[PDB]
């Protein structure tokens, strides 16, 4: 009824704030991005440093894996995204078109497409093979904080400081739904559930909300943590028990029971804001990453 996550490894090497961490879909690797303009790769199970991937001209806010674990895409303050071959380190494409910082990115499950969100308030859809922008969505009226495809890639959910979550038809580019609560504080994060039926969104009033997408209604609420300033990544954890996992501006990793909404664990170790968390695809393993005063990534493991 409660996980028992404990610190196993601390990964040091970035020289500025870390911005995101993501496990490869094959579960072998962890990728990290940082304000230091670098991508680093680490062993997912032992935290062993693997390689540094370089090329962006300014800091990086987000990284994401292709479904076959062979490619990465990164989103940078230099207004570009880059597509990387992880094994060779080669930059395969530079995606140009956004007119301001690119803040978030993702492959679709098929991995023929990339979605990106920007401080220029647009969501763009890119062709992986050619690097060309296929669609530009007038998505929001403030910076876009997160973008994510659903399980079959037919849908995109986006979030923004404008207080909205919007769901988009990938093929047509049409806005299918706008999620509106009793209030609209800045939405700093959003992502689909594994089955794509639900949407987890974070707002800058210290609140995570779980939405039923089809019914367009908020069902569960998760609080107790601190989140008023930063775009902190959260997760469904489904390898053991069903949990919600999130970073927090009090330097802790928070873990909630998905159903009861109670806090079940709080992980201590970081010395600055935990900006990012990731859940391993098959094992009960959490990766967490922290901002400038800390700069380390931590790997935690649990029996459930």
């Amino acid at each position: 009824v409660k996980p028992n996550y404990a610190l196993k490894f601390t990964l040091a090497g970035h020289t500025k704030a870390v911005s995101s961490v993501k496990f490869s879909p094959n579960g072998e690797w962890l990728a990290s991005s940082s304000a230091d303009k670098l991508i680093k790769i680490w062993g997912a199970y032992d935290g062993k440093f693997e390689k540094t991937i370089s090329g962006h001209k300014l800091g990086i806010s987000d990284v994401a894996w292709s479904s076959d674990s062979n490619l990465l895409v990164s989103a940078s303050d230099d207004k570009t995204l880059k597509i990387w071959d992880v094994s060779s380190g080669k930059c395969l494409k530079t995606l140009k078109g956004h007119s301001n910082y690119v803040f978030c990115c993702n492959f679709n499950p098929q991995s023929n497409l990339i979605v990106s969100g920007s401080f220029d308030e647009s969501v763009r859809i890119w062709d992986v093979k050619t690097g060309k922008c296929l669609k530009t969505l007038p998505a929001h009226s403030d910076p876009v904080s997160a973008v994510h495809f659903n399980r079959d890639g037919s849908l995109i959910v986006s979030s923004s400081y404008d207080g909205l979550c919007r769901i988009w038809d990938t093929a047509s580019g049409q806005c299918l739904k706008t999620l509106i609560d009793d209030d609209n504080p800045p939405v700093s994060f959003v992502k689909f559930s594994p089955n794509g039926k639900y949407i987890l969104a974070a707002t800058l009033d210290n609140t995570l909300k779980l939405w039923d997408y089809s019914k367009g209604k908020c069902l569960k609420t998760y609080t107790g943590h601190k989140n008023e300033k930063y775009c902190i990544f959260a997760n469904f954890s489904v390898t053991g028990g069903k949990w919600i996992v999130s970073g927090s501006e009090d330097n802790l990793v928070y873990i909630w029971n998905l159903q009861t909404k109670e806090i079940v664990q709080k992980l201590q170790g970081h010395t600055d804001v935990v900006i990012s968390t990731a859940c391993h695809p098959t094992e009960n393993i959490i990766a967490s990453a922290a901002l400038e005063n800390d700069k380390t990534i931590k790997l935690w493991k649990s029996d459930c």
């Binding site: 089955n195 039926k197 069902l219 469904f236 489904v238 069903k242």
Partner: peptide
């Protein structure tokens, strides 16, 4: 009331 975020 018990949500299932995994089954498709």
């Amino acid at each position: 009331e018990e949500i299932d975020v995994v089954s498709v």
